[PDB]
Amino acid sequence: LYFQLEELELDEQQRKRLEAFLTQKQKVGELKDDDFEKISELGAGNGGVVFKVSHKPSGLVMARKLIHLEIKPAIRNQIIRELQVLHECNSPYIVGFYGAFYSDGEISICMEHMDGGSLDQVLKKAGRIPEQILGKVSIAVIKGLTYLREKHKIMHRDVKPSNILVNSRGEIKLCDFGVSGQLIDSMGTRSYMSPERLQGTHYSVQSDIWSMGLSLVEMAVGRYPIMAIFELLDYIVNEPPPKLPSGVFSLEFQDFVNKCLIKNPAERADLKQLMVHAFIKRSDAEEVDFAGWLCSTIGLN
Ligand SMILES: Nc1ncnc2c1ncn2[C@@H]1O[C@H](COP(=O)(O)OP(=O)(O)NP(=O)(O)O)[C@@H](O)[C@H]1O
Ligand SMILES: CCN(C)c1cc(-c2ccccc2O)nc2nccn12
Ligand SMILES: [Mg+2]
Numbered sequence: 001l002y003f004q005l006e007e008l009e010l011d012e013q014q015r016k017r018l019e020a021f022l023t024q025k026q027k028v029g030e031l032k033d034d035d036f037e038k039i040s041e042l043g044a045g046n047g048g049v050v051f052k053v054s055h056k057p058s059g060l061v062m063a064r065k066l067i068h069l070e071i072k073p074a075i076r077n078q079i080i081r082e083l084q085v086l087h088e089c090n091s092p093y094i095v096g097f098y099g100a101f102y103s104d105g106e107i108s109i110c111m112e113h114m115d116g117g118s119l120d121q122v123l124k125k126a127g128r129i130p131e132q133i134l135g136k137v138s139i140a141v142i143k144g145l146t147y148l149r150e151k152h153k154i155m156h157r158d159v160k161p162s163n164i165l166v167n168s169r170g171e172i173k174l175c176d177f178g179v180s181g182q183l184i185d186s187m188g189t190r191s192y193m194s195p196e197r198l199q200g201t202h203y204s205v206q207s208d209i210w211s212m213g214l215s216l217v218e219m220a221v222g223r224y225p226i227m228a229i230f231e232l233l234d235y236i237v238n239e240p241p242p243k244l245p246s247g248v249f250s251l252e253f254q255d256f257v258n259k260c261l262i263k264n265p266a267e268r269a270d271l272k273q274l275m276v277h278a279f280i281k282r283s284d285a286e287e288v289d290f291a292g293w294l295c296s297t298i299g300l301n
Helices: 012-025 073-088 119-126 131-152 181-186 195-199 205-221 229-238 251-260 271-275 278-285 290-298
Strands: 036-044 048-055 060-068 097-103 106-112 164-166 172-174
Touching: 036 060, 073 097, 073 106, 073 181, 119 164, 119 205, 119 290, 131 164, 131 172, 131 205, 131 251, 131 271, 131 278, 131 290, 195 205, 195 229, 205 251, 205 271, 251 271, 251 278
Parallel strands: none
Antiparallel strands: 036 048, 048 060, 060 106, 097 106, 164 172
């Protein structure tokens, strides 16, 4: 394989992992419904269901997300075409992609199976996620958002703990980002939407930063930090943003989440500012055995 990954500025461990995923991916060509065998259900959300599946031709285990869409064949074909851009989204902070296709009313998005599931699943078992672990998660989310914005000119649009995947090798990766404008066009109890997105405002990277800040507070505290639908949304729009409880969390982490949760998107921190924030600089220097913590917390390996 003639790897052209020089632009990523990968460390040796990251380079080995990314080249290994891409090498496995070479066993996978056209994806068809008949070539899969369902192993189990990984989980489900509002828009789709995700199954752990065996791809019979390659022998690979994958996560197959199925989104029910039975629309004009030409517009569903445009969605499938737009999803093919995922073949160009190679980053240590973005879930690996095998392919996307349509079959009998469902769009399938086939991904790298992440054996640690999502941080939403981890949170249910851990209770609360330690601040040092959240430092590593924050680095991964900022780096993933920067990669999608700088290399592909897209915003995530759906940052939340269920869209941050982890594995037994200690990798942290984003999924469910808005790669397809038409899929966004064609498509509850908790909202991670920014106050400006709830009110109307055009999508900005700033809205993803709010979502990340809220997700960090939830994971730090062990509960959604904001109940009726109007009551919850009215709180986000018209009341002060949530804050981390003082004393239990470092001043750096409190300031970092505070900068993400500023109501005015112009005053709210941007990705460049967050990357050099004291919380990120401190967290990047820390030696944290994320893999060991994850495997111990959820009983992996
Ligand atoms: N690649 C993957 N590997 C392992 N688990 C996955 C993978 N992708 C998704 N999951 C799990 O699938 C479950 C359901 O995900 P999903 O259907 O996207 O719901 P959601 O994240 O709550 N909503 P949304 O992303 O907005 O559609 C979650 O519990 C994830 O942990
Ligand atoms: C709002 C979440 N949805 C369902 C969504 C998911 C994905 C997608 C899913 C998994 C991995 C990588 C992805 O990109 N891609 C989208 N493009 C537009 C919407 N998309
Ligand atoms: Mg999801």
